[PDB]
Amino acid sequence: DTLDEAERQWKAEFHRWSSYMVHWKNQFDHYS
Amino acid sequence: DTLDEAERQWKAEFHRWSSYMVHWKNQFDHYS
Amino acid sequence: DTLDEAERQWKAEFHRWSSYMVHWKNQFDHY
Protein backbone atom coordinates (compact mmCIF):
# COMPACT_ATOMS: atom_id res chain seq x y z
CA ASP A 1 0.00 0.00 0.00
CA THR A 2 1.21 3.61 -0.16
CA LEU A 3 0.82 3.75 3.61
CA ASP A 4 2.97 0.68 4.38
CA GLU A 5 5.40 2.40 2.05
CA ALA A 6 5.03 5.64 3.98
CA GLU A 7 5.54 3.81 7.23
CA ARG A 8 8.69 2.19 5.87
CA GLN A 9 10.22 5.39 4.55
CA TRP A 10 9.43 7.30 7.74
CA LYS A 11 10.92 4.73 10.11
CA ALA A 12 14.00 4.58 7.92
CA GLU A 13 14.46 8.35 7.71
CA PHE A 14 13.72 8.79 11.43
CA HIS A 15 16.34 6.32 12.57
CA ARG A 16 18.79 7.79 10.08
CA TRP A 17 18.03 11.20 11.55
CA SER A 18 18.36 9.88 15.09
CA SER A 19 21.82 8.83 14.05
CA TYR A 20 22.88 12.28 12.94
CA MET A 21 21.52 13.38 16.29
CA VAL A 22 23.89 11.06 18.17
CA HIS A 23 26.72 12.01 15.89
CA TRP A 24 26.02 15.70 16.41
CA LYS A 25 25.65 15.31 20.17
CA ASN A 26 29.07 13.69 20.13
CA GLN A 27 30.77 16.44 18.20
CA PHE A 28 29.03 18.96 20.44
CA ASP A 29 30.14 17.50 23.78
CA HIS A 30 33.73 17.21 22.50
CA TYR A 31 33.89 20.79 21.40
CA SER A 32 33.13 22.06 24.92
CA ASP B 1 -1.84 1.55 17.48
CA THR B 2 1.36 1.30 15.42
CA LEU B 3 1.12 5.02 14.69
CA ASP B 4 0.60 5.91 18.34
CA GLU B 5 3.73 4.00 19.24
CA ALA B 6 5.68 5.80 16.53
CA GLU B 7 4.13 9.02 17.73
CA ARG B 8 5.64 8.12 21.11
CA GLN B 9 9.14 7.47 19.78
CA TRP B 10 8.89 10.82 17.97
CA LYS B 11 7.85 12.66 21.11
CA ALA B 12 10.83 11.12 22.93
CA GLU B 13 13.24 12.28 20.24
CA PHE B 14 11.42 15.61 20.17
CA HIS B 15 12.15 16.14 23.87
CA ARG B 16 15.80 15.22 23.46
CA TRP B 17 16.00 17.64 20.55
CA SER B 18 14.69 20.57 22.64
CA SER B 19 17.38 19.79 25.21
CA TYR B 20 20.06 19.82 22.52
CA MET B 21 18.70 23.21 21.54
CA VAL B 22 18.71 24.62 25.09
CA HIS B 23 22.33 23.52 25.78
CA TRP B 24 23.36 24.58 22.32
CA LYS B 25 21.99 28.09 22.42
CA ASN B 26 23.49 28.65 25.87
CA GLN B 27 26.95 27.47 24.95
CA PHE B 28 26.56 29.67 21.87
CA ASP B 29 25.56 32.91 23.62
CA HIS B 30 28.51 32.45 25.93
CA TYR B 31 31.00 32.22 23.09
CA SER B 32 29.99 35.69 21.82
CA ASP C 1 -6.79 15.84 16.32
CA THR C 2 -3.60 14.45 17.87
CA LEU C 3 -2.18 13.95 14.37
CA ASP C 4 -2.93 17.59 13.54
CA GLU C 5 -1.36 18.74 16.79
CA ALA C 6 1.92 16.96 16.14
CA GLU C 7 2.15 18.54 12.71
CA ARG C 8 1.34 21.93 14.19
CA GLN C 9 3.92 21.63 16.99
CA TRP C 10 6.48 20.35 14.54
CA LYS C 11 5.97 23.36 12.25
CA ALA C 12 6.08 25.73 15.22
CA GLU C 13 9.67 24.73 16.08
CA PHE C 14 11.08 25.76 12.74
CA HIS C 15 11.39 29.50 13.24
CA ARG C 16 13.75 29.28 16.21
CA TRP C 17 15.84 26.62 14.56
CA SER C 18 16.29 28.52 11.32
CA SER C 19 17.16 31.52 13.42
CA TYR C 20 19.92 29.70 15.30
CA MET C 21 20.93 28.32 11.95
CA VAL C 22 21.28 31.81 10.48
CA HIS C 23 22.91 33.35 13.56
CA TRP C 24 25.53 30.60 13.68
CA LYS C 25 26.16 31.04 9.96
CA ASN C 26 26.98 34.74 10.34
CA GLN C 27 29.23 34.30 13.34
CA PHE C 28 30.85 31.54 11.32
CA ASP C 29 31.66 33.81 8.36
CA HIS C 30 33.29 36.53 10.44
CA TYR C 31 35.55 33.98 12.10
Partner: peptide
Protein backbone atom coordinates in the same frame (compact mmCIF):
# COMPACT_ATOMS: atom_id res chain seq x y z
CA UNK D 1 33.75 28.04 16.87
CA UNK D 2 31.23 25.50 18.15
CA UNK D 3 29.24 23.02 16.06
CA UNK D 4 26.14 24.33 14.28
CA UNK D 5 22.82 23.77 16.14
CA UNK D 6 21.46 20.22 16.10
CA UNK D 7 19.80 19.11 12.81
CA UNK D 8 16.31 20.31 11.90
CA UNK D 9 13.73 18.52 14.01
CA UNK D 10 12.28 15.46 12.29
CA UNK D 11 8.57 15.49 11.23
CA UNK D 12 5.79 13.64 13.14
CA UNK D 13 4.86 10.16 11.92
CA UNK D 14 1.98 10.19 9.46
CA UNK D 15 0.56 6.92 8.25
Amino acid sequence: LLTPPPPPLFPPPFF
